[PDB]
Amino acid sequence: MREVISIHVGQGGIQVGNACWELFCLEHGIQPDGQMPAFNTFFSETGAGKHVPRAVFLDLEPTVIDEVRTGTYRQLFHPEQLISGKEDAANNFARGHYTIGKEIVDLCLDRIRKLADNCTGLQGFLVFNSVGGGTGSGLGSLLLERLSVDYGKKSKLGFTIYPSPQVSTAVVEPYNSILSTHSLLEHTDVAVMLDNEAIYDICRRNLDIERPTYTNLNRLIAQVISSLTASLRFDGALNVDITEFQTNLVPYPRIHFMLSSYAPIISAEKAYHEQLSVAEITNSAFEPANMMAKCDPRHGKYMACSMMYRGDVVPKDVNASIATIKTKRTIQFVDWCPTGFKVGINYQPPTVVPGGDLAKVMRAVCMISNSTAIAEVFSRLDHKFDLMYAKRAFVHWYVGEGMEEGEFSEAREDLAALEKDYEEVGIET
Template sequence: MKSLASLTCAVLAFISLQADSAVAAPTNGTHPGCCKNPSIRYEWRQLSLEQRLDYIRSVKCLMALPSEGNDLWPGAKSRYDDFQGMHIYMTQKVHFNGPFLPWHRWMLYLYESELRDKCAYKGTLPYWDVSLDNTAEGFLNSPIFDNVYGVGGDGPYIEDVSNKTEFPVQKPITIPERSGCVQEGPFANTTVPMGLGYSLESTPHCLRRDFSLPIITAALSDEVIDRTIAAASFSELNVHIQGYSMQVSGMTLHAGMHLGIGGAVGDCADMYSSPGDPVFYFVHGALDKIWNDWQRRDWPARKTDIGGPDVMYGYPFNFFGDVAYENITLEYPLSFPNFGGDMLVADMMDIHGGPFCYDSVTIISLDLFLAQSTPDLVYSYHIILHLHLGQAGTQLGNSAWELYVDLLRPIFYLLEHGLGPDGRPDPNAKDVVDGGSYETFFTETSNGKYVPRSLFVDLDPSPIDEIRTGGYRQLFHPELLISGKEDAANNYARGHYTIGKEMVDNVIDRVRRVADNCHSLQGFLIFHSFGGGTGSGFGALLLERLSTEYGKKSKLEFAVYPAPRVSTAVVEPYNAVLSTHSTIENSDCTFLVDNEAVYDICRRNLDIPRPSYDHLNRLIAQVVSSITSSLRFDGALNVDLNEFQTNLVPYPRIHYPLISYAPVISASKSSHESFKVQELTFQCFEPNNQMVVCDPRNGKYMAVALLYRGDVVPRDCNAAIAALKAKASFNLVEWCPTGFKLGINYQKPMAVPVAASDGGLASVDRSVSMLSNTTAIAEAWSRLDHKFDLMYSKRAFVHWYVGEGMEEGEFSEAREDLAALEKDYEEVAADSFEADEGDIEY
């Protein structure tokens, strides 16, 4: 008999859909150290689309390998079929009895090992959190049954068996030819070699499914799941999982999943041959996860809690009359013919050592997560939701929440708030924690974890997949990482009228669910680009919907604007003009950034010869953090979110402030520079420090917000402003004599601890971000309009937009609106206070 001590320690762990942190891996198990570096067994939704395809590829690979069985199951054709053959052969010894859960736990381990060893599968065996799909709508839309990134869906409808008192046992001969065959997805038209029933000979038939939604909603309800996990003993748990009777009313989790999928004719519904359907392994992954969670509730007592009859249909499964049985013990043998011989039940029990060293955490849906989060009891908190749209918005979001430090990659907002990468307070950063208002950007859960109030959305799955599979996937709630299946192809119309339109209702629903959980929601920060398809088209569509549903809430944008000479797409001018036209009435304030200006700052100030997007995004993240620091930390003159638009936007359409930041200096130069408040203030007004390519000296300032951080006092700020006003190069419009809004926050800027060779910003005691509404920004609009005119005069690329349902007249309408915007800035710059006193009306 094989001992686990001789087996390779294949560590499996489960991760939460809450993106909760993994608990510290225990080292007190049978095999100390086995859990030090646990791999993770993911719920299907947690896998990236590439990982899902890799799993599907590996399963099909196993289906293509020759069988290694013998005369026990002669009908098997492939190595995949060997598992079905073993299951058919052993069914009567491992169902409706005590060995059911231990035996299937080892079968899952064997199956995963084969995928990895024979088919180069890179991941671990995924499981299914059925609590997320136990409604009719949820089940039908489950990603498990996706036709591209899942195992495919239902066969043609046959029969609703929910009204039957007993589930019929059907033989292949009674099933109409090809009725219920799965005809879509990666396993379409798959031939199952054995079954239905106890048939180990060759009985080839198509893979069948026959979804029965009434069984799903009854047998897999939240009440059934809660009752199961609350079982007082293993024997009770075993009954709750396997069922109370053979009638529909007595079905629970095991039968509910199998029969809900297989229905009247499907392979999954057959107790013997169900492994012929690849969904079998999701079903039993879910059951094993529940057993694992149950064991953890009272460990180590439940390491030895076992029981149940040693024969099929022994009490309490005596559905057909009493049969003689004995209760199993830890020494009960489990057989796996042709897969390595017998094991013991005891070998299946240790979840803190050996192959089943799970690091399991609570599975939780978004609704339950929000329901269990700590209420925002102090209503004065400025609750802000972050919306990151498209590739640019997602990458900006990554840099706002996460800054790279070698392999550790700490979270920037987390760093400032003294939180660890799993969203839990760092005990070594208590001073920082006590000084910050978590509730502005984070939701606190009942177990002391902080989850960002943010949604990441992209029509292209790749940028979101980077988050799903990144080092901080445990931080963000996975239901707030929303991706499509095809990108907008740099086409505003695809993002706004076709692909984006199909997705916007789902995004708004997620926004609504998160917003409804905020007692004092103040507004939204929206990160996107004007030049991309998703950022421009979908961003405009989402802003329209937000304005309708949250008209009184602030909506501030951080937008990547097309640069003069650096472009990522030929049609950027079209997208930017159309997006600006669509959002101008729906956004309260838009902070513009162009890549060329930030490239130049990185090259000139940080000595980075060829800056990457990481360098750019880190610098922009410093600005974002500075702008929002007054919402999160204490200071002498804190700035509320509403104050930005109140003080920077003199007219609704003139809401595009420039951004600059100081000091931008590398660590190697910091010891040679002075960082006095006045010098930092002057730096912000230098054209070379502006984050949009334009020269403020060619225009007039309408309003300026100076946001200081760190070791700064109001007296120094006032002195700096007085010196600035005395400079001849500073032009302020005549009709705004004050012109300045000050913000002072005591939280000093956090250093980004990267290697000096990587162009990291220096650690400084103070910094300033400047937001300025200046008429010089009209240069950028004029430049954009000129590029638009060059292309549109030849109607170049217009057919791609019209082909997505957009009317060509929208181009002319948008261009006229931008011309009017240029005129607005011109008039504002020309206006002067010339009215006679007698003409003034009050």
């Protein structure tokens, strides 16, 4: 009787949600048939066994949602929560926020209302979408607008797969990412950056697979989100609301851009060779090598940090290890948060998904941090925008739909002030 709603807009969202619902069906014992031989957070019961998950699936390119509709989970998802237009967006914002998107966002709103009226104590939203995309950026921004204007009190935890500053899957990412950032910053309360590259380096070092694919990255993201929802899913000594997250991790109304980390993530052999104590694991969780957002946190000072533990985890060693962390030297907090840590334990140890490169592991910790290194990301990203708008490139591709041009400036202007933000709050007093 305390549930979540998850939305998977765009191409990144639908893939990561595919893997994540695979994991969730694996955990709660729910079979691909939708029958089961705890689920009230995600799933819902249709009277007799055959359950349906609380989610909507939006991607106007009908290809990936077709790959779902014919996949191993054809029987599970509600045949009406699979919406897709008859065209694509092509990585520009206006193609998914002004003209094309103007069609199905109302259908999404109707479906969401007809899901929520069935909910009892719905806590938070969980959208999944890239910003470099065309339909996960525009349509997602419009849906965020509609949600933030209708319901209100509910938290809105988005999980955006930002593009790394180095690698690129498209050449117009800066535009429709600046636009997404500026259009969500006024209607979100959480935005955890999940770079698509740091996970590659992770799989290269902790897992020895020099050739990883989107499947393994999505499995890892599913693991993170499952470790997160482990609070509501099953019990534990420290059950924490999801509304806890928007309380511990929102200092000021404008600076709410967290980054996450997960530990431990190892193969079978390393687990055979390793100790995996509480101190060791909460020490490794702080290393920069496993920050989902590709950053160097030493470049800045933290502001808030929340840690969800699961497995055979003794609280006394928890307190001792976090104390030693706060006395460690390389990290640095700021003056205006002497209380920096937040903890929450659960007795649901992680799952060994068959074939998943991850190995069976007794303990786990997920660390979501509101930090200051993320700021510099914008800088480098703003970098790109400079060289792109110093020549008025691709503007015609945007005006060829109906989105006014001057908006660019505004959006860009906003991010400029954004940098000012992390030079006004990051400064001691």
